[PDB]
Design a protein around this nucleic acid. Structure first.
Lengths: 98, 204, 143
RNA sequence: CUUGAGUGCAGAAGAGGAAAGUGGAAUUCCAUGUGUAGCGGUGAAAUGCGCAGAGAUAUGGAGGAACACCAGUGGCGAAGGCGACUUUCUGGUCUGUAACUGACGCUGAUGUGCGAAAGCGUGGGGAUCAAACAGGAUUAGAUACCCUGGUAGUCCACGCCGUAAACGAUGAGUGCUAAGUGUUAGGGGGUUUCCCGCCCCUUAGUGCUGCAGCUAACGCAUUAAGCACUCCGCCUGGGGAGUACGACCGCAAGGUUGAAACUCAAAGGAAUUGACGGGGACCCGCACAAGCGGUGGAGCAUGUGGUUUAAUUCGAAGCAACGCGAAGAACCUUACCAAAUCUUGACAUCCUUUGACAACUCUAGAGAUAGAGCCUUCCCCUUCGGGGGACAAAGUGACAGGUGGUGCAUGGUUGUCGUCAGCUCGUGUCGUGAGAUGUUGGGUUAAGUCCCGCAACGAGCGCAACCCUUAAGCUUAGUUGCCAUCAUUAAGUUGGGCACUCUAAGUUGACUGCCGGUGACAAACCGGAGGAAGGUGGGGAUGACGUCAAAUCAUCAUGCCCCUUAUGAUUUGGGCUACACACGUGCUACAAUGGACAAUACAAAGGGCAGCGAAACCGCGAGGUCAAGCAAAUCCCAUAAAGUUGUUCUCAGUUCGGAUUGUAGUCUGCAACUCGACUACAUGAAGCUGGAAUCGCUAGUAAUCGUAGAUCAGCAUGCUACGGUGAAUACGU
């Protein structure tokens, strides 16, 4: 994922935080083809901390975003979304007769 | 897509070229020659409110003919203006002219005239919509088969961009035999830029 | 929806050569395909010399199946083939095995294959076998 | 006093209850026989059972449970509940009669008793089933679903507990208020030779549909949620909370009664619109499928990231950024950096002072530029001046300028879902109201395509159509184009002809149009004839309402802010291209379907003015010399490649391979070191079809081989356009 920051300079602190979080999804299933992160300071002028995230999946993908006061609140709030946006999928359950 | 004024899609079939001269590869000279005239007419825009002008260029001369609704203005009483326009033009064209005004009939039905009209009543601190109400009102009056009239920008001198248009009269647009005269305008007072995109349908 | 017929073979007045040169016709190059195939009709008609159609027609009745399978939860059904698909797939494993000898010539691998296949041997008679071991093994739960 | 109530008299039905007593199937087990190797269960398996003989089959025995079909929107019950049969006891209900009493009635706090299943105790019995529980499997994980088993209990009596969605979410009783239709127990009348057949009326219960009326609306409507009366109980925003304390009951579990502190400005009901569904019905789609060909594997390029840096310029990114902006970074460009630099400034207008506006060198400078020499030198008008196109340097203050910021201040412009088939309104109706109607039901088309039916009718945008190209012919005209009859040249070269092809503009043509069939005859659909072309012939253009606060202040313009001896502007050089690396995209190899070499056939399109440079000449070739022709149907650019004919190589890391590095050169540029391409010589890296995963495509398509054009001094593995060759698959959804 092109962890790029518009008007905010991605430190190693931020990269560590991010990747750390998505590691937790190895519960299901990782399977790590790619992942992206869009972060930006969009002045309102209360002015943001925007987070938009993208997950490419097996035979499909799931984007995810959210805004909040600061970067860490945006990464934590956008979490618990790209998990339930993922869970569930399958099973599906057998037939025919006849 | 998404959309284009059909004039580009209608031209080459149902209308003349907007500027004309013999077909030689010295176009960078002659096109940018035409433009030097096309600029200067804006001085007359504030005085003439003409629709447009298409130039011919005879074998050693030039002919232009201006589509105005203000004949006696531009003619003056007895041509006290047209001739110093020949020479102030010829001064810059480095070559002579034979202007011959081509007055507008039917008369103030046209798109461009009405376009900058409503833009200017708007520029004089007007609730925008009523201007289009009286516009369309005198539009179906004069006899026309299809109209709408669109506006963009920060309306009423206020917060973020908006838009509106009043559609009345059936307007064949996706056709190719419509022969309709699209227009555009630009005028602000204090807050940004509020152009319009009028439409008509008269004949085929 | 129709299948864009080929008229005759202009060589020996058969047809399926034409259907077969086009399967050698890679890159849209016909002449090299036609070349190497008719050459193979020289080689196989030389070795144990005979008509084209003995080794050819026999071999393509030694590998050219009668039943195939298809999936549909997932239950693989044995199915009767439409004869265009039958002949189609016969020639499919024909060329698609012809390279798979792993040899040098344009034609020996071919003429080896059709000669061998006229004799009910090689991987094309084999895929007929194994295919018909998926048929009547899988009669039960999907027919 | 009887019309209320009740007793009587004669009738009727009933899974009404309690106790008792028999009967049969069916499961489980056991004994026995037969008899061999699996049974059982699952989405798929295993747990389990099986050689000690299972399961199956068959006879018999055991004993516990619940009592099939009948069974009904059927009945009975006050409520819970009540379904094998028979017996004993017993209550209750409806009908009709009425002679008896003679208003004795309704409700009912308190109070009192009945009361699902679960559960507790004293015992008993204990087949099936199964909490708990043990185990397997599933799951990222599974104490759970799922499978295997198994306890309590389920069961009887006796006691206790006293709750429920205990629901008609509708308190008891009395009485009136339209219909129609059924089912149950009766009664009465008629008809029928006898009503068993049938008709009519009535009581009671029971369901269904529906006026009035009510209703917030859903909806109830003679079994009222209508109309009124009498009696009881219950409610006062939600949460906290039916909770705590207290009191009574209970063996206990728990129950009954039942608050506040503080908190919130909402909580909630009916219905409407839109969306969503791990819902359904239908339909279309390289979405599947059936095929073919690719990425990812090696080297190269390119953009980006990441790294770096004095600078390595700005932005753009899921499909819809990543061969994009930028359709050409050596300087220029360049925005970035260094230095040398200027300030009404790089440049623009106005006011003032003049003027035709300055070429060639010298000095220094890196140039910028200065120092000078120097020739820019009122040209049109002028009556003596002035006016004036255009000027010098200076002043002049506005100002100039900002690639300084804000694409969420905007316009403009453009991608997107989507070339999908939909999207609105005027009028009227409906409805408290939002809102619906039209736009719905049936068919049909690719489509809101049409037709039918319809409180809807009409109109709009949208599709098609209209236009461009293409396939056939007719005409018009014949050069630079063609040679058919010819004669003729090396050569359509010359004569001649425009006949042919060709050539650009108006013609005719395809429109379910003609027919046949299918079809609510209509809509249409299937088929057939002809026709060059049959089902909108193929493609192009056109992209609805609109979503994405999509993108762009760096196209242009611009609201606002900021700067102004600099956040502006000038010059020489650097840099925008660095690389441990990664992402995308393309290119080239991994070879005999082939590589090396010789001879030979075939296009389309399009460029050209001082550009296209014919032949000849030089050269290993890039290129260098010369110069015919030609603003093009001409001449030139420019010769097609794949292919065809052969020869050889004969399966090697090979004549595969073609990166690497050096050497020697050509072109352009003032200048090819950071940073141009190409030619000759050598050197010969990795790499044998790429792993999981992953992408496109339905016919001239894919795939492959060529060609030109722009961008240009120089320069495209890119883009655009042109052709050559040229298949496999498409069942079905």
């Amino acid at each position: 994922f092109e962890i790029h920051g518009d008007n905010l300079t991605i430190t190693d602190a931020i990269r560590n935080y991010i990747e750390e979080k998505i590691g937790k999804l190895e519960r299901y299933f990782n399977d790590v083809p790619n992942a992206v992160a869009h972060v930006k300071v969009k002045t309102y002028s209360n002015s943001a901390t925007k987070i938009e995230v993208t997950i490419p999946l097996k035979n499909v993908t799931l984007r995810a975003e959210e805004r909040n006061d600061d970067l860490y609140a945006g990464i934590d709030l956008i979490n618990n979304k790209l998990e339930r946006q993922v869970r569930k999928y399958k099973t599906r359950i057998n037939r025919k007769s006849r | 897509g998404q959309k284009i004024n059909p004039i580009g899609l209608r031209v080459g079939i149902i209308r003349d070229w907007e500027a004309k001269w013999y077909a030689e590869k010295d176009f960078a000279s002659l096109l940018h020659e035409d433009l030097k005239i096309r600029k200067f007419i804006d001085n007359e825009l504030k005085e003439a409110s003409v629709s447009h002008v298409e130039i011919e260029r005879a074998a050693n001369r030039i002919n232009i003919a201006i589509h105005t609704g203000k004949p006696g203005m531009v003619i003056g009483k007895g041509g006290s203006e047209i001739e110093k326009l020949r020479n102030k033009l010829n001064a810059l064209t480095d070559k002579k002219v034979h202007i011959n005004v081509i007055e507008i009939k039917k008369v103030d039905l046209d798109a461009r005239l009405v376009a900058e009209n409503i833009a200017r009543q708007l520029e004089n601190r007007a609730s925008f919509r009523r201007v289009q109400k009286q516009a369309i009102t005198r539009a179906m009056k004069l006899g026309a088969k299809g109209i709408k009239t669109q506006v963009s920008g920060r309306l009423g001198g206020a917060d973020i961009a908006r838009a509106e248009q009043y559609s009345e009269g059936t307007v064949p647009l996706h056709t190719l035999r419509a022969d309709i005269d699209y227009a555009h305008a630009e005028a602000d007072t204090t807050y940004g830029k509020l152009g319009v995109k009028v439409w008509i349908y008269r004949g085929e | 929806v129709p299948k864009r017929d080929v008229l005759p073979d202009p060589i020996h007045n058969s047809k399926l050569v034409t259907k077969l040169i086009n399967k050698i016709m890679l890159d849209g190059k016909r002449g090299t395909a036609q070349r190497i195939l008719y050459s193979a009709f020289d080689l196989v008609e030389q070795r144990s010399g005979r008509d084209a159609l003995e080794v050819f027609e026999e071999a393509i009745n030694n590998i050219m199946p009668v039943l195939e399978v298809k999936a549909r939860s997932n239950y693989q059904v044995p199915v009767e083939v439409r004869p265009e698909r039958r002949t189609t797939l016969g020639l499919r494993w024909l060329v698609n095995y012809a390279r798979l000898r792993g040899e040098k010539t344009m034609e020996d691998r071919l003429a080896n294959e059709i000669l061998d296949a006229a004799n009910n041997t090689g991987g094309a008679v084999k895929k007929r076998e194994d295919t018909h071991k998926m048929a009547e093994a899988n009669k039960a739960f999907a027919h």
